[PDB]
Structures are given as structure tokens and as C-alpha cells.
């Protein structure tokens, strides 16, 4: 180990967080995402079996990376005297949801559908397994083109999955719930409704439906482009001004709008080949 394992390429995206380079497993040779992430900078501390101190974040990516394609699965990792390594999957070619919105515009609502049901089969993986993402975005799904298959990436801000109120939060603010705003609380599920929420209007809309605190506290939804009356009340669903008023994920799925959902290749030959 460890700079001979892998041939490390361009800086992907980087800030407080860490950096994220391209790189490639010299025996394959497979495309793979290196992050690093300085000790100094990790907040939030887990624990493995063996008792190892380690960045939560290794923590929640050990317990998703089962195999379920949804989500980018942790490869290896290693600790370094001022930094951990994280060696995770890179699909190509891909590219993220945000970069993706950017070039388009707005999205069909069948495009939008098929990244919307996807995005919700992911969360409920990462749900299944224990974990909580919480910065679920479009910076934050990445599309493997070639598939049409999303995949969720960054846990770190994540935590693990529990049932009682969750009073911390570093995730992105203009995605957080009014009640996080109002009160510095919240659960994890409705939270994460939440975020669905804005994220399904972002891939209609082409923009987040709210800048400020103000307009998340009073959760009026405008709708600045044509948007289906289904579509726009599955949206309003997620955005209740009270968490025990949003949907289930049963219900989001149960929702008009999202029924008769193309698969992944159907999705890619369709609108990304
Ligand atoms: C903060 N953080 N922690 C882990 C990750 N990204 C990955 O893990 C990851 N990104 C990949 C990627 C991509 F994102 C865009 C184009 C091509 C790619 F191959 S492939 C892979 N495994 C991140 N990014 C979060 C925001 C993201 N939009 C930034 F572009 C990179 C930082």
C-alpha cells in the first residue's frame, strides 16, 4: 500500500469536507473514486468490530455496501497519521444529477420518475441497512449513463438510522425541513421526505423551490415551470409544514405519479444515449 495499489487522477470536487480524485486500481483496472479526509476536520467519530476509531462515515458506507447498486459502495479504506482514504466506486462514464439538471433543464416527468423511483429504492436501502444519509441532493446522486442507474454518494454527513429526535444536523440548508429551521429538530425519515421533496421539484423545476429560512418556514410551493397536477401534489406531499403529514415511502411509491416507472436501461436508451 498504498500510492502503488492506485494511479490517482484529476481532483473531482473538493472543500471543508475533503478531496475526491479520480484514480484507478492498478490490477484491473477499475475506475475508482479517492477521498481523502483530514482527522482534524471529521466531526462526527464511529467505531468498527474491532474496536477501531474511525470516521463515521466508514462506518455507514461498511453498512451499505452490501451490493445493491444504488448506492456507491466502499472498496477499502486506509488510515494515515492525519488523514483516512476512502477507495470507492466510480461508474463511467457519469455524471452527477446537478451537472446533469444543468445541462438540460428542467427534466421530463418520465425521466424524472425513473431518477426520482431510484433515488427512493436507495434511501430505502440505506434505511434497511441502518443509515441515515441526510444530504440527499442532486450534487449528491451521481447517473451511470450508460445504465441509467443512479447511485447515492457522500455519507458524510450521515448518521445512523434511529427512532428519537435527531438535534444536529450538517447537511445542505436550503434542503433541510422547517422544523430544523424553527426548532433545531427533527426525525430522520421526515427529514429525508423532506428532502425528497425538494429534490423531485428541482428535477421538474430546474431550481430549488426555496432560497431562504422564511420560505422554508412558510412552505408555499410556486411552480415556475409546467409540472403535472400529480406531479405537483406528490411534491406538496413531501413539503407538509408537519413532518407526521408527509408521506410514508410506501406512499411516495403508492403515488399516481409514480406508478408504471421505466426500468434503468429503458431510462437510459430513452433519454441518455
Ligand atoms: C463529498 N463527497 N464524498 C464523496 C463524493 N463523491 C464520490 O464518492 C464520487 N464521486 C464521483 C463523481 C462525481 F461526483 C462527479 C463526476 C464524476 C465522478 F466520478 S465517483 C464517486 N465515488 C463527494 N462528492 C460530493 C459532490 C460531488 N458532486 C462532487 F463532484 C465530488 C464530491
Not at 442507474?149 to 427512532?163: M, N, Q, R, T, V
Amino acid at each position: 500500500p498504498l500510492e502503488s495499489q492506485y494511479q490517482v487522477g484529476p481532483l473531482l470536487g473538493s472543500g471543508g469536507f475533503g478531496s475526491v480524485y479520480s484514480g484507478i486500481r492498478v490490477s484491473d483496472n477499475l475506475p475508482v473514486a479517492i477521498k481523502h479526509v483530514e482527522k482534524d476536520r471529521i466531526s462526527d467519530w464511529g467505531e468498527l468490530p474491532n474496536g477501531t476509531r474511525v470516521p463515521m462515515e466508514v462506518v455507514l458506507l461498511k453498512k451499505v455496501s452490501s451490493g445493491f447498486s444504488g448506492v456507491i459502495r466502499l472498496l477499502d479504506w486506509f488510515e494515515r497519521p492525519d488523514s483516512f482514504v476512502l477507495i470507492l466506486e466510480r461508474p463511467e462514464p457519469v455524471q452527477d444529477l446537478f451537472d446533469f439538471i444543468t445541462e438540460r433543464g428542467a427534466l421530463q416527468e418520465e425521466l424524472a420518475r425513473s431518477f426520482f423511483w431510484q433515488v427512493l429504492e436507495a434511501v430505502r436501502h440505506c434505511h434497511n441497512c441502518g443509515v441515515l444519509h441526510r444530504d440527499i441532493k442532486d450534487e449528491n446522486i451521481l447517473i451511470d449513463l450508460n445504465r441509467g442507474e443512479l447511485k447515492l454518494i457522500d455519507f458524510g454527513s450521515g448518521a445512523l438510522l434511529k427512532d428519537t429526535v435527531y438535534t444536529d444536523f450538517d447537511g445542505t440548508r436550503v434542503y433541510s425541513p422547517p422544523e430544523w429551521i424553527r426548532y433545531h429538530r427533527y426525525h430522520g425519515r421526515s427529514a429525508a421526505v423532506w428532502s425528497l421533496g425538494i429534490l423531485l421539484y428541482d428535477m421538474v423545476c430546474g431550481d430549488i423551490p426555496f432560497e431562504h429560512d422564511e420560505e422554508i418556514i412558510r412552505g408555499q410551493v410556486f411552480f415556475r415551470q409546467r409540472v403535472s397536477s400529480e406531479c405537483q401534489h406528490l411534491i406538496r406531499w413531501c413539503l407538509a409544514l408537519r413532518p407526521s403529514d408527509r408521506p410514508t415511502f410506501e406512499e411516495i411509491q403508492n403515488h399516481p405519479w409514480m406508478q408504471d416507472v421505466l426500468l434503468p436501461q429503458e431510462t437510459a436508451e430513452i433519454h441518455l444515449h
